Amino acid sequence: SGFRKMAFPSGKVEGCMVQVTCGTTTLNGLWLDDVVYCPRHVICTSEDMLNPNYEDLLIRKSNHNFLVQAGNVQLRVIGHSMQNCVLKLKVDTANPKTPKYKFVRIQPGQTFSVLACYNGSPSGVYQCAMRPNFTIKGSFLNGSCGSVGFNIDYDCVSFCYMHHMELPTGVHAGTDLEGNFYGPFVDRQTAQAAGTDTTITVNVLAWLYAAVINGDRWFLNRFTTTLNDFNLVAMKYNYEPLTQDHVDILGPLSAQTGIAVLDMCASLKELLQNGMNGRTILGSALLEDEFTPFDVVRQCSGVTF
Amino acid sequence: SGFRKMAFPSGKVEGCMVQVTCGTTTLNGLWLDDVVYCPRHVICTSEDMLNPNYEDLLIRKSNHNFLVQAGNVQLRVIGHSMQNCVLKLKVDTANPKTPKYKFVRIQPGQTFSVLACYNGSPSGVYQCAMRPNFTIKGSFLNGSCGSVGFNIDYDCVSFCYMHHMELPTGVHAGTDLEGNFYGPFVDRQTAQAAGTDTTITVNVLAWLYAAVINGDRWFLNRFTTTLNDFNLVAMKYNYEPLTQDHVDILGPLSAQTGIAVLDMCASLKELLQNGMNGRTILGSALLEDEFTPFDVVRQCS
Numbered sequence: 001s002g003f004r005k006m007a008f009p010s011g012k013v014e015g016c017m018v019q020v021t022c023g024t025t026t027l028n029g030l031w032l033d034d035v036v037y038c039p040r041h042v043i044c045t046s047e048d049m050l051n052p053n054y055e056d057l058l059i060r061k062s063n064h065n066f067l068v069q070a071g072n073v074q075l076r077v078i079g080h081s082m083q084n085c086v087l088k089l090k091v092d093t094a095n096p097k098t099p100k101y102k103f104v105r106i107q108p109g110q111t112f113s114v115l116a117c118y119n120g121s122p123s124g125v126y127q128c129a130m131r132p133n134f135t136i137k138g139s140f141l142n143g144s145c146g147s148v149g150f151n152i153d154y155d156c157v158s159f160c161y162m163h164h165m166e167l168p169t170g171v172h173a174g175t176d177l178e179g180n181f182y183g184p185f186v187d188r189q190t191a192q193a194a195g196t197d198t199t200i201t202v203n204v205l206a207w208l209y210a211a212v213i214n215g216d217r218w219f220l221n222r223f224t225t226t227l228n229d230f231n232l233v234a235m236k237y238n239y240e241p242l243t244q245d246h247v248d249i250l251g252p253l254s255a256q257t258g259i260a261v262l263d264m265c266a267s268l269k270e271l272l273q274n275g276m277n278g279r280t281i282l283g284s285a286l287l288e289d290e291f292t293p294f295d296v297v298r299q300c301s302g303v304t305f
Numbered sequence: 306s307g308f309r310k311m312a313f314p315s316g317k318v319e320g321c322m323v324q325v326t327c328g329t330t331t332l333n334g335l336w337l338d339d340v341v342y343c344p345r346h347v348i349c350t351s352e353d354m355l356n357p358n359y360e361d362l363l364i365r366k367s368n369h370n371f372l373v374q375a376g377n378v379q380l381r382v383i384g385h386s387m388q389n390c391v392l393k394l395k396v397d398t399a400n401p402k403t404p405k406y407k408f409v410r411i412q413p414g415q416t417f418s419v420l421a422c423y424n425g426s427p428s429g430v431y432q433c434a435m436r437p438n439f440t441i442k443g444s445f446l447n448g449s450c451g452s453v454g455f456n457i458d459y460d461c462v463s464f465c466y467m468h469h470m471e472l473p474t475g476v477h478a479g480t481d482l483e484g485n486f487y488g489p490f491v492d493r494q495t496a497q498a499a500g501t502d503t504t505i506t507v508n509v510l511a512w513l514y515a516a517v518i519n520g521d522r523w524f525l526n527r528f529t530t531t532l533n534d535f536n537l538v539a540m541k542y543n544y545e546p547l548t549q550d551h552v553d554i555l556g557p558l559s560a561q562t563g564i565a566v567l568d569m570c571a572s573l574k575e576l577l578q579n580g581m582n583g584r585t586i587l588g589s590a591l592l593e594d595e596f597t598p599f600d601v602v603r604q605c606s
């Protein structure tokens with residue numbers, strides 16, 4: 001029993017974290033095979049960040065301008081290139097701790113574990129979701145750039161996020177490992193704001209199933225709803241639309257608990273219209289949306305890596 | 306910026322997790338140097354669960370009755386001994402992945418990361434607090450026994466918990482790595498209940514300081530309180546007494562935010578009286594108590 005916000009075991013990623021220094025800036029890099037990936041803004045001064053021409057800033061750098069440290073060992077940089085907003089530093093040594101990995105771009109609503117790092121040293125691991133507005137509600141201080149987000153599927157690490165910046169509201173923005181930003185953000189010190197966010201409906205439903213599995217049923221009711229009537233309610237309360245794909249994805253949890261997806265939607269509609277009435281669900285007075293249906297199944301079944 | 310429930314990176318502990326089998330039972334072990342630590346109840350059969358005589362059950366076992374698997378390699382058990390409720394299996398190979406470590410027994414209110422494991426394989430990492438009633442609100446299924454709790458301040462892993470059992474309310478009980486249970490629990494399936502749990506007051510105050518550091522001040526007020534008046538009110542909401550030790554511990558956070566500890570206590574008294582009125586504090590509609598003063602400073606600074 002119990003239901004916790006759980007991250008993947010971070011060991012496979014810890015063995016890839018390195019420190020990258022370019023001039024006065026130090027941030028984190030991800031060392032996989034003979035390449036170290038890091039945010040391209042590592043080459044910027046504070047003034048350059050106002051309006052950077054990354055090609056112009058990069059052409060002026062030599063390999064020796066990048067200092068890469070893996071633990072207490074210096075990695076020799078033998079090449080450098082840019083891919084979108086990520087800098088790729090070719091090093092003279094393949095990482096012997098390179099796990100089986102892939103680079104995957106995730107969609108809003110998908111969750112992943114973040115290994116927060118400072119000076120190439122992992123400091124913490126936490127689970128988060130890619131918000132519908134393409135930000136993540138992370139926990140990052142100065143020096144955390146280059147920290148990565150990932151999932152594990154069997155023994156393969158799927159890297160999905162690299163940290164680049166914090167927006168004025170305290171939320172975070174970054175890219176996939178191919179350097180493409182999630183959201184309409186740019187790597188520049190300019191006025192940028194996260195758009196109005198919405199709740200990840202399919203994830204709230206998955207967490208309501210987790211609550212039922214854990215013995216919390218007070219919110220269940222005799223009612224059902226149509227997908228169109230539910231979506232009219234979801235739009236009203238800034239919840240993301242629930243698609244037939246989401247309904248299909250929740251099928252296994254619906255079969256396990258005996259609560260149809262549209263039956264659980266009727267519980268959610270009532271919760272949105274009435275509140276919790278002083279009650280909690282899984283120790284929360286808010287509807288949690290950072291557990292996917294796969295996370296709930298994995299946690300309530302015990303999948304290992 | 307941001308404030309998340311954050312666990313320590315689990316890699317150093319993942320390299321220590323092994324599978325221990327004794328007869329029909331399989332659970333997790335912690336392999337450090339040439340010793341594998343696991344719950345002594347791994348030697349119990351279905352008839353031993355209520356009143357096991359562990360000394361009597363253990364004397365009947367030979368080294369080859371314990372199968373220890375580290376990855377796809379069987380380690381050879383060359384000795385065994387019991388220390389309180391933990392079984393220590395001497396193996397023929399020192400773990401090459403043994404990190405710098407220590408065993409620490411923690412106090413209620415302390416937090417730690419749990420690496421949940423099944424069949425010697427890590428499945429997830431989460432953050433826990435040792436509740437005032439000496440249970441933990443973990444997430445554990447059958448096969449999770451032997452999973453450990455730890456902290457990693459610097460490069461040294463301090464192991465503080467080994468999972469043994471789940472109580473009827475769905476909360477968890479275990480021991481330190483010397484095999485001493487936290488709380489009045491025993492490794493017997495006899496009727497056991499967690500005592501009434503309470504909120505970790507010092508941790509709630511630490512988290513209110515974290516909220517102020519992160520830019521939120523809506524809950525502050527122009528009042529202060531005496532420590533005794535605060536305790537009289539807080540106990541009515543099932544909050545733990547706040548001691549002068551706790552006030553002293555919150556000193557650094559008080560100096561950083563400019564909010565005196567007893568001033569923050571008055572905010573807490575008001576929150577207990579009024580609730581949040583549709584507002585949240587650090588993305589929560591409840592008062593969070595599983596961040597210690599040390600956690601807040603580490604995460605914010």
Ligand SMILES: O=C1C[C@H](NC(=O)[C@@H]2CCOc3ccc(Cl)cc32)CCN1
Nearest residue numbers: 041140141142164165166187188189306
């Ligand atoms: O999550 C974090 C990282 C954050 N650092 C940035 O946001 C840098 C410096 C500011 O100006 C910018 C502007 C753009 C870019 Cl890509 C990065 C940055 C410091 C606080 N925590």
Ligand SMILES: O=C1C[C@H](NC(=O)[C@@H]2CCOc3ccc(Cl)cc32)CCN1
Nearest residue numbers: 346349354447448449450470492493494
């Ligand atoms: O992970 C689990 C949990 C549970 N295991 C116990 O109940 C053990 C069995 C042996 O006899 C005992 C005796 C005492 C104690 Cl604390 C535990 C136990 C059922 C099987 N799986």
Ligand SMILES: [Cl-]
Nearest residue numbers: 252293294297
């Ligand atoms: Cl599924």
Ligand SMILES: [Cl-]
Nearest residue numbers: 410411412415
């Ligand atoms: Cl302690």
